[PDB]
């Protein structure tokens, strides 16, 4: 855990796609989330009760990490990707959002650069992914299929 | 709910594998998590606000149950088991971790005994399960498959 | 213009500048026996176990 947490950040999209579990494992487990799960009492805890302001700040940090995690999982579920780090969809690429070939982006761009190129199309793409899944379920409820 | 919560604890691994929903259902639902979800206000709540230390202790207990649940679910997701109480993997058994035949462990050992036999190989096994899933995804991204 | 489709990836090494609350920690060695030290009481979370970089 955290042995190369953002190690692929400067690498290409292709190479970086091979380290996806590395970042996923660090979204729900900060130091305080490890101390909170010791078999022994952590001892510190009395401090956070005697002084309730510190107790509240710690809980807010823990609750937020959980809420952010769950929201990303909910979107993957809605889009039809329950689990999987990499999933294919039926939404075609518009070639307006970005107009580059596969041999250019997977080999020459980093994920940070990509993110800064299509950031204002994010909501359009997410909207289409949701519509696609709804259409798929409508087709599933037809026993003659395709 | 809680009608035989650890009832299989003294039973064999084989028999105990048939009660897995019994323990799973009790990880997110303690008494306070039921009172918190009443249609009526619980009434007690004012106590936990007037005296903020008790309010904080209760939240810490609730947040922790959620964090522990989610961490186990994240590991199952990483290992390629989204959902399912029982899942098969591609990691071979080493016969060093434990060197017993199937007819000995499934019929004669309890899960508590098993846990005390291979506890210091837990991290090795978990590491291998993650590597296995990453290798599987690398193979999935090949349209000629196997 | 290639016939491509949207693929969703999770666990991508991307970040944005942000403000948040840091939680503080200390090296629980000599400082652990200070007892009445203010900083040794507040920054209670143990750290620096040959920390990663």
């Amino acid at each position: 855990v955290f042995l190369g947490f953002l190690g692929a950040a400067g690498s290409t999209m292709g190479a970086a796609s091979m380290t996806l579990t590395v970042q996923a494992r660090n979204l729900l487990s900060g130091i305080v989330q490890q101390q909170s799960n010791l078999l022994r009492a952590p001892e510190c805890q009395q401090h956070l009760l005697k002084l309730t302001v510190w107790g509240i700040k710690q809980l807010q940090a823990r609750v937020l990490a959980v809420e952010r995690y769950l929201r990303d999982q909910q979107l993957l579920g809605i889009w039809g990707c329950s689990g999987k780090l990499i999933c294919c969809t039926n939404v075609p690429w518009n070639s307006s959002w970005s107009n580059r070939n596969l041999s250019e982006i997977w080999d020459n761009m980093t994920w940070l650069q990509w993110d800064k190129e299509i950031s204002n199309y994010t909501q359009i793409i997410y909207g289409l992914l949701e519509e696609s899944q709804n259409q798929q379920e409508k087709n599933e409820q037809d026993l003659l299929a395709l | 709910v809680f009608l035989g919560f650890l009832g299989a604890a003294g039973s064999t691994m084989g028999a105990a594998s048939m009660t897995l929903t019994v323990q799973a259902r009790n990880l997110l639902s303690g008494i306070v998590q039921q009172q918190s979800n009443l249609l009526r206000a619980p009434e007690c709540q004012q106590h936990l606000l007037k005296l903020t230390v008790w309010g904080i202790k209760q939240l810490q207990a609730r947040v922790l149950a959620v964090e522990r649940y989610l961490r186990d679910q994240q590991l199952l997701g990483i290992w390629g088991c989204s959902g399912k109480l029982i899942c098969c993997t591609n990691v071979p058994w080493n016969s060093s971790w434990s060197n017993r035949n199937l007819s000995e462990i499934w019929d004669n050992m309890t899960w508590l005994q098993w846990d005390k036999e291979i506890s210091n190989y837990t991290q090795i096994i978990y590491g291998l399960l993650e590597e296995s899933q990453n290798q599987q995804e690398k193979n999935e991204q090949d349209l000629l498959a196997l | 213009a290639e016939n491509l489709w949207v693929t969703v990836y999770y666990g991508v090494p991307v970040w944005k500048d942000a403000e948040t609350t840091l939680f503080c920690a200390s090296d629980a060695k000599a400082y652990e026996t200070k007892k009445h030290n203010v900083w040794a009481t507040h920054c209670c979370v143990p750290t620096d176990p040959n920390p990663q970089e």
Partner: antibody, heavy 120, light 105 residues
Framework: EVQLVESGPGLVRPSETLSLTCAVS?????????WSWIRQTPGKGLEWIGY????????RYNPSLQSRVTISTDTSGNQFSLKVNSVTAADTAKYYC?????????????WGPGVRVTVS | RMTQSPAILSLSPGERATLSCRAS??????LAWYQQKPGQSPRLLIY???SRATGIPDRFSGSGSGTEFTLTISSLEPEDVAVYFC?????????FGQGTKVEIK
């Protein structure tokens, strides 16, 4: 970038096994899955024979030859080969060595010149 | 599992040539086209119905889905005399159509 060079008998008799090989230059065949054989038969057109996965040794064969063809590798020689049993006149064809790369990110082929084989 | 049509086209230089290919079963979007000149092994032109292979002139294009596909060559040149093949990439048998010829006069 690789080059594929086929070689083998240009004549096989009825009920004999036909054996053709392909050398690979520029890359390894112990990896790079998708080494394959393609047959071009006058009067029928193109069809696949099958392919091999250099990393595992597994193979897949077109059902018409499920009981007739073997594909295997010589990773030391960095060459691979095709053997078809019980060859008959109907199997006269131009045989090719090919490399098919098909992934989520790239698509390409490399073809060798092939071997024309007469079957009596 | 796919049939091309017509067996042969004969076009004037600069004219646009079109070849159709029909599947017996859906092949989704997994269709490739190849160009085989006499004495040559087939060259990949188009993959996934409309994506050009690296090194292919913009004369070449195509479209279609499911079972109905077309290969188009605009501004046809004498160097395009070849047999064009329709290749199925949506199933295990990977069949090919029979191949059609385009000749420039």
């Amino acid at each position: 970038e690789v080059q594929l060079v086929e070689s083998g008998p240009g004549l096989v008799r009825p009920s004999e096994t036909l054996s053709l090989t392909c050398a690979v230059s520029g890359d390894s065949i112990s990896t790079n899955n998708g080494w394959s054989w393609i047959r071009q038969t006058p009067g029928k057109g193109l069809e696949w024979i099958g392919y091999i996965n250099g990393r595992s040794g597994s193979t897949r064969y077109n059902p018409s030859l499920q009981s007739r063809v073997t594909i295997s590798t010589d990773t030391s020689g960095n060459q691979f080969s095709l053997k078809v049993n019980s060859v008959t006149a109907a199997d006269t064809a131009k045989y090719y060595c090919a490399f098919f790369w098909s992934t989520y990110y790239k698509r390409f082929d490399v073809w060798g010149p092939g071997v024309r084989v007469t079957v009596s | 599992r796919m049939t091309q049509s017509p067996a042969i086209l004969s076009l004037s230089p600069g004219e646009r040539a079109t070849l159709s290919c029909r599947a017996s079963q859906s092949v989704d979007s997994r269709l490739a086209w190849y160009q085989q000149k006499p004495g040559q092994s087939p060259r990949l032109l188009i993959y996934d119905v409309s994506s050009r292979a690296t090194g292919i002139p913009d004369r070449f294009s195509g479209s279609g889905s499911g079972t109905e596909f077309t290969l188009t060559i605009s501004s046809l040149e004498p160097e395009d005399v070849a047999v064009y093949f329709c290749h199925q990439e949506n199933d295990w048998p990977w069949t090919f159509g029979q191949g059609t010829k385009v000749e420039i006069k």
